[PDB]
Antibody, heavy 231, light 219 residues
Framework: QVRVVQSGAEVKNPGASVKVSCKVS????????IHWVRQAPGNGLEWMGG????????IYAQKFQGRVTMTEDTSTDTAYMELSSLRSDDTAVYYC?????????????????????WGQGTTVTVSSASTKGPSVFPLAPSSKSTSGGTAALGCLVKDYFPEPVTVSWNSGALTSGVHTFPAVLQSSGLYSLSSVVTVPSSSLGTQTYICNVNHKPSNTKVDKKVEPKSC | DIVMTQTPLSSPVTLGQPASISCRSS???????????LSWLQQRPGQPPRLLIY???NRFSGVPDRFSGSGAGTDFTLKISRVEAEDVGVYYC?????????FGQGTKLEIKRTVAAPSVFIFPPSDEQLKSGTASVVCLLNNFYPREAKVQWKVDNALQSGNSQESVTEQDSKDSTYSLSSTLTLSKADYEKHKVYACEVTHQGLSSPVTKSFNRGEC
């Protein structure tokens, strides 16, 4: 299987450097070109540069020439991007695209002779502010949570900073009927978010629903079991 | 740097109906060899971009036949014969002919669907949160089609202003609907000083404003 995995989200201070990893699975990082593309949230895609795996020349965009360095660890199959002297304009999601050779593996729809596969993305926030872990509370199902036989439950991820928080359900086993809402910014300057899911109320007694929240910048992994109670 | 601009700004289209996005380049996309390297990528909400077309007509493997691409010189067009709920998203056009590679500003493809009234759910504050000192109440508006929706937090029949924050989902890739989440946050003290917490929702699919309420009961 052709699998591209990237570093967790990171928060860096202005003037500092940021490093993100692109690890390739299922195919050697040889004769496979690596590209780095930056996406400002809710903005356009900016191609930072390309790196040739078999030592070909690596071209950097005029914008990021002085600040970006690209390197490869062929042994671990991981490419690295490093952007220095970070400025607030650099807060964005960073992607590495494996645009080379033949992927070979299907990966759901088979990439085959095609070259491009894209990383999941690494959110990088440039800010002097203090990192704060999220607070996870349950949104318990109730008679106030049921409609036409279906009940609704969830998790409230409150007061976290910076932005990237990932929520999964039953370790990823539950995705049908799931809604992870975009985060809101409290006056405090901290983000809050909610993730809900609709399930058969008849099942409420037999099934176990657990929400998995990861806030990589804070280094927090929480698993909160949502169980029905009260009103 | 070669410029890439997508002619369609935003597009509300009926299901099963065709669609076509245009890309315009300031300079010729023909390379020094004699080819033209133009790519089309689709990004679903909160997802990495997936490459659908290369050159202009070359369709990537595993890419639906519904997608097609045709361009000439500086103009290029991506066409979806029929539109499905899974196509919602943002379409971008990339050029690999000249360094630095360029991307279009993107174009959002939305979906016209029949009206759907939301389902309203009210969630009270957890005891753990009360221990932390605060109290958040959440009103959930699930699977409503018209994006426009109204939410009103009422505490003991008293309408509130402020202390509320809400978010709307990106268009569903299955339903093509929308979901809303509104949280009213109060201090533990404010929360205990009252009895009934309710949220009244008004939407087009709703004949009359639906109100979901509860009594504190100390939680």
């Amino acid at each position: 299987q052709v699998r591209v995995v990237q570093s967790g989200a990171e928060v860096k201070n202005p003037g500092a450097s940021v490093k993100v990893s692109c690890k390739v699975s299922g195919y050697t990082l040889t004769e496979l070109s690596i590209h780095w593309v930056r996406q400002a949230p809710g903005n356009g895609l900016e191609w930072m540069g390309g790196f040739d795996p078999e030592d070909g020349e690596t071209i950097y965009a005029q914008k990021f020439q002085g600040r970006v360095t690209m390197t490869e660890d062929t042994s671990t199959d991981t490419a690295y991007m490093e952007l220095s002297s970070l400025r607030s304009d650099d807060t964005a999601v960073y992607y590495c695209a494996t645009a080379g050779a033949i992927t070979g593996t299907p990966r759901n729809f088979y990439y085959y002779y095609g070259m491009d596969v894209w990383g999941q993305g690494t959110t990088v926030t440039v800010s002097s502010a203090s990192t704060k872990g999220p607070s996870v509370f349950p949104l318990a199902p109730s008679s106030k949570s049921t409609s036409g036989g279906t009940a609704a439950l969830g998790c409230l991820v409150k007061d976290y900073f910076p932005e990237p928080v990932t929520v999964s359900w039953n370790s990823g086993a539950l995705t049908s009927g799931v809604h992870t809402f975009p985060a809101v910014l409290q006056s405090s300057g901290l983000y809050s978010l909610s993730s809900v899911v609709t399930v058969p109320s008849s099942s409420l007694g037999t099934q176990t629903y657990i929400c998995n929240v990861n806030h990589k910048p804070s280094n927090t992994k929480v698993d909160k079991k949502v169980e029905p109670k009260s009103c | 740097d070669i410029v890439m601009t997508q002619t369609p700004l935003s597009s509300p289209v009926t299901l099963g109906q065709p669609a076509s996005i245009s890309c315009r380049s300031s300079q010729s996309l023909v390379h020094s060899d004699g080819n033209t390297y133009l790519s089309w990528l689709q990004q679903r909400p909160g997802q990495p971009p997936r490459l659908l077309i290369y050159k202009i007509s070359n369709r990537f493997s595993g890419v639906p036949d519904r997608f097609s691409g045709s361009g000439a010189g500086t103009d290029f067009t991506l066409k979806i014969s029929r539109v499905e709920a899974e196509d919602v998203g943002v379409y971008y056009c990339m050029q690999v002919t000249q360094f630095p590679y360029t991307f279009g500003q993107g174009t959002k493809l939305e979906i016209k669907r029949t009206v759907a009234a939301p389902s309203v759910f009210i969630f009270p504050p957890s005891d753990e949160q009360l221990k932390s000192g605060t109290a958040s109440v959440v009103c959930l508006l699930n699977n409503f089609y018209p994006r426009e929706a109204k939410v009103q937090w009422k505490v003991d029949n008293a309408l509130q202003s402020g202390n509320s924050q809400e978010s709307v989902t990106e268009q569903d890739s299955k339903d093509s609907t929308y979901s809303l989440s509104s949280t009213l946050t109060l201090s533990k003290a404010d929360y205990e000083k009252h009895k009934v917490y309710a949220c009244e929702v008004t939407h087009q699919g709703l004949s009359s404003p639906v109100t979901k309420s509860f009594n504190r009961g100390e939680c």
